[PDB]
Scaffold this motif. Structure first.
Motif, PDB file in Angstrom:
ATOM      1  N   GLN C 128      38.931  48.899  71.661  1.00  0.00           N
ATOM      2  CA  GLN C 128      38.412  49.802  70.640  1.00  0.00           C
ATOM      3  C   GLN C 128      38.641  51.258  71.026  1.00  0.00           C
ATOM      4  O   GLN C 128      39.031  52.076  70.184  1.00  0.00           O
ATOM      5  CB  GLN C 128      36.928  49.529  70.405  1.00  0.00           C
ATOM      6  CG  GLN C 128      36.658  48.424  69.401  1.00  0.00           C
ATOM      7  CD  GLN C 128      37.400  48.624  68.096  1.00  0.00           C
ATOM      8  OE1 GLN C 128      38.044  47.707  67.588  1.00  0.00           O
ATOM      9  NE2 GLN C 128      37.306  49.825  67.540  1.00  0.00           N
ATOM     10  N   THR C 152      38.068  52.269  53.382  1.00  0.00           N
ATOM     11  CA  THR C 152      36.982  51.760  54.205  1.00  0.00           C
ATOM     12  C   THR C 152      35.961  51.039  53.331  1.00  0.00           C
ATOM     13  O   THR C 152      35.564  51.570  52.285  1.00  0.00           O
ATOM     14  CB  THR C 152      36.315  52.904  54.965  1.00  0.00           C
ATOM     15  OG1 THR C 152      37.319  53.706  55.598  1.00  0.00           O
ATOM     16  CG2 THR C 152      35.378  52.366  56.026  1.00  0.00           C
ATOM     17  N   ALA C 156      30.524  49.685  55.913  1.00  0.00           N
ATOM     18  CA  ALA C 156      31.259  50.002  57.133  1.00  0.00           C
ATOM     19  C   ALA C 156      30.325  50.102  58.332  1.00  0.00           C
ATOM     20  O   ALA C 156      30.705  49.748  59.453  1.00  0.00           O
ATOM     21  CB  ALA C 156      32.040  51.302  56.950  1.00  0.00           C
ATOM     22  N   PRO C 158      29.425  52.527  60.384  1.00  0.00           N
ATOM     23  CA  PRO C 158      30.076  53.043  61.607  1.00  0.00           C
ATOM     24  C   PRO C 158      29.084  53.716  62.551  1.00  0.00           C
ATOM     25  O   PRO C 158      28.910  54.934  62.584  1.00  0.00           O
ATOM     26  CB  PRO C 158      31.097  54.034  61.046  1.00  0.00           C
ATOM     27  CG  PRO C 158      30.450  54.556  59.813  1.00  0.00           C
ATOM     28  CD  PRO C 158      29.636  53.425  59.234  1.00  0.00           C
ATOM     29  N   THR C 167      37.412  54.149  62.153  1.00  0.00           N
ATOM     30  CA  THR C 167      36.689  53.087  61.466  1.00  0.00           C
ATOM     31  C   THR C 167      37.565  52.434  60.411  1.00  0.00           C
ATOM     32  O   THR C 167      37.561  51.207  60.260  1.00  0.00           O
ATOM     33  CB  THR C 167      35.414  53.640  60.835  1.00  0.00           C
ATOM     34  OG1 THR C 167      35.759  54.594  59.824  1.00  0.00           O
ATOM     35  CG2 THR C 167      34.564  54.320  61.891  1.00  0.00           C
ATOM     36  N   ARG C 168      38.342  53.240  59.688  1.00  0.00           N
ATOM     37  CA  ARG C 168      39.233  52.690  58.675  1.00  0.00           C
ATOM     38  C   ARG C 168      40.252  51.743  59.296  1.00  0.00           C
ATOM     39  O   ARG C 168      40.489  50.650  58.774  1.00  0.00           O
ATOM     40  CB  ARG C 168      39.923  53.829  57.926  1.00  0.00           C
ATOM     41  CG  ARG C 168      40.970  53.390  56.931  1.00  0.00           C
ATOM     42  CD  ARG C 168      41.567  54.592  56.227  1.00  0.00           C
ATOM     43  NE  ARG C 168      42.371  54.203  55.077  1.00  0.00           N
ATOM     44  CZ  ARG C 168      43.674  54.420  54.969  1.00  0.00           C
ATOM     45  NH1 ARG C 168      44.353  55.029  55.927  1.00  0.00           N
ATOM     46  NH2 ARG C 168      44.310  54.016  53.874  1.00  0.00           N
ATOM     47  N   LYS C 170      40.098  50.084  62.309  1.00  0.00           N
ATOM     48  CA  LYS C 170      39.497  48.879  62.874  1.00  0.00           C
ATOM     49  C   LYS C 170      39.035  47.931  61.775  1.00  0.00           C
ATOM     50  O   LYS C 170      39.192  46.709  61.894  1.00  0.00           O
ATOM     51  CB  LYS C 170      38.344  49.241  63.811  1.00  0.00           C
ATOM     52  CG  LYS C 170      37.239  50.049  63.177  1.00  0.00           C
ATOM     53  CD  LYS C 170      36.243  50.543  64.208  1.00  0.00           C
ATOM     54  CE  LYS C 170      35.412  49.409  64.769  1.00  0.00           C
ATOM     55  NZ  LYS C 170      34.142  49.908  65.359  1.00  0.00           N
ATOM     56  N   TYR C 171      38.487  48.469  60.684  1.00  0.00           N
ATOM     57  CA  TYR C 171      38.085  47.599  59.590  1.00  0.00           C
ATOM     58  C   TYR C 171      39.290  47.049  58.843  1.00  0.00           C
ATOM     59  O   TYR C 171      39.221  45.944  58.301  1.00  0.00           O
ATOM     60  CB  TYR C 171      37.140  48.338  58.648  1.00  0.00           C
ATOM     61  CG  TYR C 171      35.716  48.285  59.138  1.00  0.00           C
ATOM     62  CD1 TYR C 171      35.267  49.161  60.111  1.00  0.00           C
ATOM     63  CD2 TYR C 171      34.831  47.340  58.649  1.00  0.00           C
ATOM     64  CE1 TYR C 171      33.974  49.108  60.572  1.00  0.00           C
ATOM     65  CE2 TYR C 171      33.537  47.278  59.104  1.00  0.00           C
ATOM     66  CZ  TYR C 171      33.114  48.164  60.066  1.00  0.00           C
ATOM     67  OH  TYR C 171      31.820  48.109  60.523  1.00  0.00           O
ATOM     68  N   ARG C 174      40.166  44.072  60.986  1.00  0.00           N
ATOM     69  CA  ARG C 174      39.190  43.012  60.763  1.00  0.00           C
ATOM     70  C   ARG C 174      39.414  42.335  59.419  1.00  0.00           C
ATOM     71  O   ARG C 174      39.329  41.108  59.313  1.00  0.00           O
ATOM     72  CB  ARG C 174      37.774  43.571  60.850  1.00  0.00           C
ATOM     73  CG  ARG C 174      36.692  42.516  60.747  1.00  0.00           C
ATOM     74  CD  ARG C 174      35.319  43.139  60.885  1.00  0.00           C
ATOM     75  NE  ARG C 174      34.991  43.965  59.732  1.00  0.00           N
ATOM     76  CZ  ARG C 174      34.423  43.510  58.625  1.00  0.00           C
ATOM     77  NH1 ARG C 174      34.065  42.244  58.502  1.00  0.00           N
ATOM     78  NH2 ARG C 174      34.202  44.348  57.617  1.00  0.00           N
ATOM     79  N   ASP C 175      39.712  43.117  58.380  1.00  0.00           N
ATOM     80  CA  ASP C 175      40.003  42.540  57.074  1.00  0.00           C
ATOM     81  C   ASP C 175      41.300  41.748  57.089  1.00  0.00           C
ATOM     82  O   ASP C 175      41.424  40.754  56.368  1.00  0.00           O
ATOM     83  CB  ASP C 175      40.066  43.643  56.020  1.00  0.00           C
ATOM     84  CG  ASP C 175      38.697  44.184  55.664  1.00  0.00           C
ATOM     85  OD1 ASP C 175      37.725  43.857  56.377  1.00  0.00           O
ATOM     86  OD2 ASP C 175      38.593  44.939  54.676  1.00  0.00           O
TER      87      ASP C 175
END
Ligand code: AND
Lengths: 128, 55, 226, 261, 338
Positions: C128, C152, C156, C158, C167-168, C170-171, C174-175
């Protein structure tokens, strides 16, 4: 015996077009999901694209998503990859891989080295 | 690599040197073996419960 | 007579072995084996915590066995079938060749396998801090063209709040995993994604909670509630 | 009317007995479907409910009042079977607790054997004790006609069949609420969007759980306090409880139907 | 020069193909077209052994056709007396990921191996009377997929590192190494005379070696997917292979060719186990659809079904006298059919 022979692809100017044809013998083509993988010089095998039985589940890697297209002819027992907009960094040896098990939505270890159901591959180089 | 290539080619010639009898002869031999030992095959012919160890 | 004598001896030996076997069954039932799988050697599986490696750890007086594959070839087609009965597959992915695409392909193959169709996956997203450093610095965008259109999600949350760009990203990753997880299978097995910074000790608590949810879902499926 | 109540009760008991026998033979003949603990507990509950319904039908149909011993025996057996059914519903709830609330370290040796011991022993102890105080607590001179072998002391009826059922019902309702809360938490996960759209399977499973946990016995509280419609609802939904158990746990399951073919 | 070697190998493969085609004159079905069928025989579950906790990966019959050994992923190795359905010698394993187990011809030793890349040899009879690890063999870099006892002093193992090894139990060292497989070897089968053995690997090929020096006499390529199981004909002049492409095939030695393939349209699951009856007339194949199909080996028509399991079978075997057939499964149940 299972034999995959790839053809097409030589020296192409950047932005050019290419067609790679994989001819398969020794198994029922329509039962298996086909894959195109590639190995850049000193980088290792990487997955490029795949197509399911009778198409309809095409998917590509992000780098070639807008340019490369993959098709298959079950009647002709052939796999095709069209590369319409070449770029220098996709110079690699391209391999036609047949996933290990028939009638499977999942298939394993195409990118793994020393994989049995993989062709010899063709060099595709893009340079001035 | 190249070593694998020569080993494979050597194995290929060595395999090609051997000789094979007709497929019909091997088929007949398999059929003859099956027929000769058909009597002493408990799975082929149901065995009575008298001498069946798994009564 | 010999025959009743040897039958009695065999019967008493069988009784002794039955006692030992029920004693072993008591231990075997309360173990909750896990399979620690990683996309590559770059992923920091070791710090998450030949042939096969065993790790025993207890969380709230609950035993856990983690098996890490060692001296095995890269072709996992055959031996992965030995892990269809594990409680969970802890899939570790370095979110920092395109290793992310390889991890996604491996996750898809695991998810869509016929013998692993009932096995749940605990997804860990390592690196991360490395991902944050790469995002702030001027390779993720070109590898995934759809990242430009991505936005995002509303939930979120965050908590670190380092940047609205990390954050955008990493998400988005994840998506990318959750798309495969949701599309391929429903009502048989579940995917639990978590973000890990590799400097936190809360990983075992997250694994414990995910295992609790997995066993709860398995028990619920017995009544066809799920 | 009282006359209609008898007819509805007889029809419900007959249907429940028939379909509970069907469920028992299906779950005993095919071993492939009784691997898990819930299936074995279901088998035990179905056996208890079938015995209760059969003995209730026998008691209602037969009219014996010149035989003190036979009437006492019939009343004792009816009370015991009712208590066994309540205890097995409570044991289903307890298994639910051991499977969903306490998730880890739930293995014990002879799980089904211990459950059977409790479920068929506690009612036996209760009936033996109440017989020990006096065997006239079961004679004559719920009771549908005037003359019907049943408890007549009016004191042990509250302690052993109302309070016992009250505790069982409290446990069953609490575990039912726990299961519903966890199920709603799962349904609200929303991993990527519009997760777990409501389908016909979920309400079918919920109804099967309601009839398996004996929540429908709660209509007794309103029926006894009077609310004639509630009385009919209670009789209808508890007389054919075994019928709905068969529907939701024998016919509804796909594996059982596969075994039938 | 690499291209020249590839062309040379391709030409040699073509020449071998023409030699095989010239060898073939009539199919085995044409030969056995006038043979009376078996008669749709049925076999019931004579016994059920239910002592294992986890899935059963392997089992092996004893020489006396009475004792059998089974290995299960709960780290257990149990020797069942099938006549009296009793059990003896519940051997705990150091590693719980066993995938194969073997019974010594003499009945004195038991072998087991798995994901630990090690073959453990246990002495069944000891002065203390307790089964203990007689010796540990660790010359493999991959998981042990199969192992077979040669003569109670030598053992042949196949691993996931695409190699087979013939060991010396006394010295605990590899005596011979058989190489030539691309994919990891999944199974091996000893010849009745213990002079040769066949091995099937993850590639479509199956190779026949001779244990004396191990130079891969012959190679057979008829399948299309991984060869999971292999079994050797009783007369020793043929063998049968089962693969993941939902077919069984009967190859024969001294002809280096296919004879007949056993498959059906409604079969879309791979083969996990293959075995022959006492006379070789029947071929028993375990499937992934939880069933076991008994084929007439001479006609390739299904003669029986053995649907007694809940999960995939993964192992089966036939007694030396051919009295009964034992099938394991992933439901932790062993079944003896007769
Ligand atoms: C429903 C129940 C009690 C529960 C039984 O399953 C069926 C039975 C029939 C007659 C009912 C009785 C409840 C109490 C009643 C309603 C009276 O007081 C008059 C007739 C009685």
């Amino acid at each position: 015996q299972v034999q995959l022979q790839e053809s097409g692809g030589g020296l192409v100017q950047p932005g050019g077009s290419l067609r790679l044809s994989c001819a398969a013998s020794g198994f029922t083509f329509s039962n298996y999901k086909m894959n195109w993988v590639r190995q850049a010089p000193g980088k290792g095998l990487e997955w490029v694209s795949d197509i399911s039985q009778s198409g309809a589940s095409i998917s590509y890697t992000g780098s070639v998503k807008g340019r490369f297209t993959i098709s298959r002819d079950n009647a002709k027992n052939t796999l095709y990859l069209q590369m319409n907009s070449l770029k220098p960094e996709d110079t690699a040896v391209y391999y036609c891989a047949r996933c290990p098990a028939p009638f499977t939505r999942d298939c394993f270890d195409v990118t793994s080295t020393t994989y049995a159901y993989r062709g010899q591959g063709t060099q595709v180089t893009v340079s001035s | 690599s190249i070593a694998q290539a020569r080993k494979l080619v050597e194995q290929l010639k060595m395999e090609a040197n051997i000789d094979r009898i007709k497929v019909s002869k091997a088929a007949a031999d398999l059929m003859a073996y099956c027929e000769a030992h058909a009597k002493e095959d408990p799975l082929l012919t149901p065995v009575p419960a008298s001498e069946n160890p798994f009564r | 007579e010999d025959q009743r004598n040897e039958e009695k001896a065999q019967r008493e030996a069988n009784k002794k072995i039955e006692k030992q076997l029920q004693k072993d069954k008591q231990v075997y039932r309360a173990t909750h084996r896990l399979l620690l799988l990683g996309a590559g050697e770059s992923g920091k599986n070791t710090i998450v915590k030949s042939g096969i490696f065993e790790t025993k750890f207890q969380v709230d007086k609950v035993n856990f066995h983690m098996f890490d594959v060692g001296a095995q070839r890269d072709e996992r087609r055959k031996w992965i079938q030995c892990f269809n009965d594990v409680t969970a597959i802890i899939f570790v992915v370095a979110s920092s060749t395109n290793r992310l695409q390889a991890a996604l392909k491996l996750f898809d193959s695991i998810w869509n396998n016929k013998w692993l169709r009932d096995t749940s996956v605990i997804l860990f997203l390592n690196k991360q801090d490395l991902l944050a450093e790469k995002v702030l610095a001027g390779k993720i965008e070109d590898y995934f063209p759809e990242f430009a259109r991505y936005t995002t999600p509303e939930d979120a949350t965050p908590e670190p709040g380092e940047d609205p760009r990390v954050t955008r990203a990493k998400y988005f990753i994840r998506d990318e995993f959750l798309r495969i997880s949701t599309a391929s299978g429903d009502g048989r097995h579940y995917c639990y994604p978590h973000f890990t910074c590799a400097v936190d000790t809360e990983n075992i608590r997250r694994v414990f909670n995910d295992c609790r949810d997995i066993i709860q879902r398995m028990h619920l499926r017995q009544y066809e509630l799920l | 009317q009282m006359m209609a109540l008898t007819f509805i009760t007889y029809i419900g008991c007959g249907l429940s007995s028939i379909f509970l026998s069907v469920t028992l033979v299906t779950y005993i003949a095919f071993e492939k479907i009784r691997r898990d603990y819930p299936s074995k507990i279901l088998i035990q509950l179905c056996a208890a409910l079938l015995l209760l319904n059969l003995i209730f039908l026998l008691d209602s149909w037969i009219a014996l009042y010149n035989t003190r011993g036979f009437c006492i025996a019939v009343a004792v057996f009816l009370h015991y079977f009712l208590l066994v059914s309540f205890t097995w519903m409570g044991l289903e709830a307890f298994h639910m607790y051991l499977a969903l609330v306490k998730v880890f370290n739930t293995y014990i040796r002879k799980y089904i054997l211990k459950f059977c011991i409790v479920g068929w022993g506690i009612p036996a102890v209760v009936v033996s004790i109440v017989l020990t105080i006096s065997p006239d607590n079961y004679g004559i001179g719920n009771g549908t006609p005037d003359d019907f072998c049943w408890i007549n002391s009016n004191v042990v009826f509250y302690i052993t069949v109302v309070g016992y059922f009250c505790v069982i019902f409290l446990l069953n309702v609490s575990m039912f609420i726990v299961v519903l809360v966890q199920l709603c938490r799962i349904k609200k996960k929303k991993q990527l969007g519009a997760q777990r759209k409501t389908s016909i399977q979920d309400l079918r499973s919920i109804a099967g759980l309601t009839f398996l946990l004996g929540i429908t016995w709660g209509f007794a509280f309103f029926a006894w306090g009077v609310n004639v419609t509630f009385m009919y609802l209670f009789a209808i939904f508890n007389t054919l409880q075994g019928f709905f158990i068969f529907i939701f746990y024998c016919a509804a399951k796909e594996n059982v139907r596969k075994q039938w073919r | 020069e690499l291209d020249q070697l590839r062309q040379e190998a391709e030409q040699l493969k073509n020449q071998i193909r023409d030699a095989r085609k010239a060898c073939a004159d009539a199919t085995l079905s044409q030969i056995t077209n006038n043979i009376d069928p078996v008669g749709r025989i049925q076999m019931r579950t004579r016994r059920t052994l239910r002592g294992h906790l986890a899935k059963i990966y392997a089992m092996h019959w004893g020489t006396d056709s009475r004792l059998l050994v089974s290995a299960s992923q709960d780290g257990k190795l149990i020797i069942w007396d099938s006549y009296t359905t009793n059990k003896v010698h519940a051997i705990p394993l150091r590693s719980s990921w066993v995938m194969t187990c073997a019974y010594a011809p003499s009945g004195n030793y038991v072998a087991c191996g798995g994901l630990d890349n090690i073959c453990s040899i246990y002495n069944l009879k000891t002065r203390e009377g307790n089964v203990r690890v007689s010796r540990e063999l660790a010359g493999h870099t991959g998981y042990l997929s199969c192992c077979r006892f040669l003569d109670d002093n030598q053992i042949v193992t196949s691993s996931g590192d695409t190699t087979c090894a013939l060991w010396d139990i006394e010295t605990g060292q590899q005596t011979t190494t058989f190489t030539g497989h691309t994919g990891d070897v999944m199974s091996l089968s000893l010849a009745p005379d213990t002079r040769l053995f066949v091995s099937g690997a993850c590639d479509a090929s199956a190779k026949l070696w001779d244990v004396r020096e191990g130079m891969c006499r012959q190679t057979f390529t008829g399948h299309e997917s991984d060869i999971n199981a292999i079994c050797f004909f009783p007369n020793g002049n043929a063998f049968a292979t089962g693969s993941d492409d939902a077919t069984c095939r009967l190859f024969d030695l001294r002809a280096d060719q296919e004879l007949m393939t056993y498959s059906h349209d409604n079969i879309i699951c791979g083969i996990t186990s293959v075995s022959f009856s006492k006379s070789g007339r029947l071929l028993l194949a375990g499937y992934d659809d939880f069933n076991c199909n008994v084929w007439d080996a001479l006609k390739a028509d299904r003669a029986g079904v053995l649907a007694g399991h809940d999960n995939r079978v993964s192992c089966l075997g036939v007694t030396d006298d051919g009295m009964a057939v034992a099938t394991g499964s992933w439901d932790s149940f062993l079944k003896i059919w007769n």
